[PDB]
Enzyme design. Structure first.
Site, mmCIF file in Angstrom:
data_model
loop_
_atom_site.group_PDB
_atom_site.id
_atom_site.type_symbol
_atom_site.label_atom_id
_atom_site.label_comp_id
_atom_site.label_asym_id
_atom_site.label_seq_id
_atom_site.Cartn_x
_atom_site.Cartn_y
_atom_site.Cartn_z
ATOM 1 N N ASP A 66 3.552 -11.999 8.480
ATOM 2 C CA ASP A 66 4.041 -12.714 9.652
ATOM 3 C C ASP A 66 4.219 -14.179 9.270
ATOM 4 O OD1 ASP A 66 1.776 -10.977 11.911
ATOM 5 O OD2 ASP A 66 3.685 -10.323 11.088
ATOM 6 N N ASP A 100 4.072 0.790 19.305
ATOM 7 C CA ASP A 100 2.763 0.173 19.601
ATOM 8 C C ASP A 100 1.959 1.177 20.423
ATOM 9 O OD1 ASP A 100 3.221 -2.516 18.535
ATOM 10 O OD2 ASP A 100 4.775 -2.552 20.101
#
Length: 250
Positions: free
Chosen positions: A129, A10
């Site tokens: 997701d 990230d």
């Protein structure tokens, strides 16, 4: 094919969010040095997910891709707010091997086909997701904030029909925890697609990777467990190979 071990970084403003614990590095928060390091100790691929402020995001992501491409020799995917073809194209041309799209693909499934028509299906990773809602696996967008009302089963089939090359399957029911990958969700998706499935969310120990591969995943993604050295990449590959998993030790 051989199973792959993927490290997810990230990033924001050119830096690793929350940094890492690798003291050996000159800069433990430099995503390029960290990615380079990972490629030297056994990681098969990298994923970089950017959350830089919109005003500087485009240039920040392009600069990161350029630098990564010349420093690392393993495949890498870039993602995080890629909303259209022109953004995906600039990033691939600048050096990324693949792009990950998620909310933009659900809202316009032809975006999958647009990118694949110029860059091939193998350049398109659709990040899905999903979470259980009233007994059904549902697709969520906007970083898990919106229940789309679309069944995982239907979206998986549509993603392959539109020309995606790989599915990055994150279980919101396990993501952020260390209780293990959502093997029931992986096993649910496995028979619905011929595409490579990257398991994501829930990794906490080496045995979790074995379970995800028995469930049918083609790759297993993790971040924090690697960055904070809870799991050693070399030890993990040795463990998986010991137990019959076809990983690359080469």
């Amino acid at each position: 094919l051989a199973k792959r071990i993927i490290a997810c970084l990230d990033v924001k403003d050119g830096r690793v969010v929350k940094g890492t614990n690798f003291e050996n590095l000159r800069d433990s928060g430099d995503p390029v040095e960290l990615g380079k390091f990972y490629s030297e100790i056994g990681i098969d691929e990298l994923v970089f997910l950017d959350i830089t402020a919109s005003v500087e995001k485009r240039k920040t992501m392009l600069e990161l891709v350029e630098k990564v491409a010349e420093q690392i020799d393993i495949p890498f995917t870039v993602g995080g707010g890629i909303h259209d073809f022109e953004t995906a194209s600039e990033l691939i041309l600048r050096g990324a091997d693949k792009v990950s799209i998620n909310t933009a693909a659900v809202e316009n499934p032809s975006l999958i086909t647009q990118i694949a028509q110029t860059f091939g299906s193998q350049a398109v990773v659709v990040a899905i997701d999903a979470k259980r809602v009233d007994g059904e696996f549902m697709v969520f967008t906007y970083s898990g904030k919106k229940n789309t009302g679309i069944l995982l089963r239907d979206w998986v089939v549509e993603v392959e029909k539109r020309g995606a090359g790989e599915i990055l399957l994150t279980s919101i029911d396990r993501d952020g925890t260390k209780s293990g990958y959502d093997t029931e969700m992986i096993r649910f998706v496995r028979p619905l697609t011929t595409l490579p499935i990257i398991a994501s969310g829930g990794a906490g120990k080496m045995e979790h990777f074995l379970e995800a591969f028995l469930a049918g995943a083609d790759a297993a993604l993790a971040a924090s467990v690697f960055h904070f050295r809870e799991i050693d990449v070399r030890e993990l590959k040795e463990y998986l190979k010991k137990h019959g998993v076809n990983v690359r030790l080469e």
